[PDB]
């Protein structure tokens, strides 16, 4: 994990997230690995959810391999579980409301 845990200004264009310990999240962003850890757990989601739209399907699939490309649910303490259809769509990883297609 990081050795610098709460020293960075808020990043902009992040593309990955990683759990190193039970309290610190590591956002892989173009400036590097910016780590954060709040006072409380069950607020890691407030940091991770701001960059969920930048996740690709392979990163999502390798965050939980045995779940077979089904959308993932972000738990409050940062853990990943397999989603269910009645879970909230804002806390679901990889599911979509409208497919962003375009014809050539």
């Amino acid at each position, epitope marked *: 994990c990081c050795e610098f845990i709460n020293v960075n200004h808020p990043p902009e264009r992040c593309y990955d997230f990683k759990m190193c310990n039970r*309290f610190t999240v590591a956002l892989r962003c173009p400036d590097g690995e910016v780590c*954060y850890s709040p006072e409380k757990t069950a607020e890691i989601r407030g940091i991770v959810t701001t960059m969920t739209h930048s996740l690709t399907r392979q990163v999502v699939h390798n965050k939980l391999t045995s779940c077979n490309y089904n959308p993932l649910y972000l738990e409050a303490d940062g853990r990943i579980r397999c989603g269910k259809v009645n879970d909230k769509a804002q806390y679901l990883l990889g599911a979509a409301g409208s497919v962003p297609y375009r014809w050539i």
Partner: antibody, heavy 120, light 109 residues
Framework: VHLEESGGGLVKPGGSLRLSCVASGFSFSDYYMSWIRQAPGKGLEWLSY????????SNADSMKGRFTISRDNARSSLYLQVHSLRVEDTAVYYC????????????????WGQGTLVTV | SALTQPPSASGTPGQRVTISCSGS????????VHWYQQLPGTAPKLLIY???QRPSGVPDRFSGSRSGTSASLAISGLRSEDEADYYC???????????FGTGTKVTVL
């Protein structure tokens, strides 16, 4: 960074007086500031914080309903008001600046101001 | 203050001080511990702001540590400027608020 408090001294019981804190060096209005009272005998107990541009959050379960925290982000100032001035409320008060990241709290109470003594 | 600490501790100039902060599964077991130092006659100062993280200005001889629902603060190489009051703090979800410790006295002779 600088935090200057005011509004204490000798106040008679049964009244009410507001304790003010002024912040300096930073004016983005994204500050998760908090108050702490400390009775003589060197005991710190947490009172309350407030959202950077929103609602206050209540006290602990020791005692409730007596403390209010207000903000004046135009002045970038913090305020505490007590409901009643019991004789046990004689204490020294600290205003502390937390700066938020994505709306959650990181770095709790990394900057404390000069304590203000209230005698009652 | 729902966090329980011993009242006082003693030391030698250049020695080690271990401060224990105890709690339950509702305050430390879910949320972080931050240690604050208050020198006598001054506003309190942040000493450790995560389970093991120092701010800029705090020397590397101060160290934080974690064990289940409890925390420890170790001062190596005690000096006369370490003679202060120390307060552990953690967030509680059951009470929904920040909880401090009773208080510790570190005396250097």
């Amino acid at each position: 960074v600088h935090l200057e408090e005011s509004g204490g001294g000798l106040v008679k019981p049964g009244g009410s007086l507001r304790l003010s804190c002024v912040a300096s060096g930073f004016s983005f209005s994204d500050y998760y500031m908090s108050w702490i009272r400390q009775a003589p005998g060197k005991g710190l107990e947490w009172l309350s914080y407030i959202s950077p541009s929103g609602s206050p959050t209540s006290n602990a379960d020791s005692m409730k309903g007596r403390f209010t925290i207000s903000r004046d982000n135009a002045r970038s100032s913090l305020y505490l008001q007590v409901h009643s001035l019991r004789v046990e409320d004689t204490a020294v008060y600290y205003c502390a600046r937390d700066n938020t990241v994505f709306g959650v709290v990181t770095t709790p109470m990394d900057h404390w101001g000069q304590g203000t003594l209230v005698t009652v | 203050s729902a966090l329980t600490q011993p009242p006082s501790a003693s030391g030698t100039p250049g020695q080690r001080v271990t401060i224990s902060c105890s709690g339950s599964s509702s305050n430390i077991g879910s949320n972080t511990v931050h240690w604050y130092q208050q020198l006598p006659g001054t506003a309190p100062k942040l000493l450790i702001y995560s389970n093991n993280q120092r701010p800029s200005g705090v020397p590397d001889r101060f160290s934080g540590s974690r064990s289940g629902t409890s925390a420890s603060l170790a001062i190596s190489g005690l000096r006369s400027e370490d003679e202060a009051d120390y307060y552990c703090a953690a967030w509680d979800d059951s009470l929904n608020g920040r909880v401090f410790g009773t208080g510790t006295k570190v005396t250097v002779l």
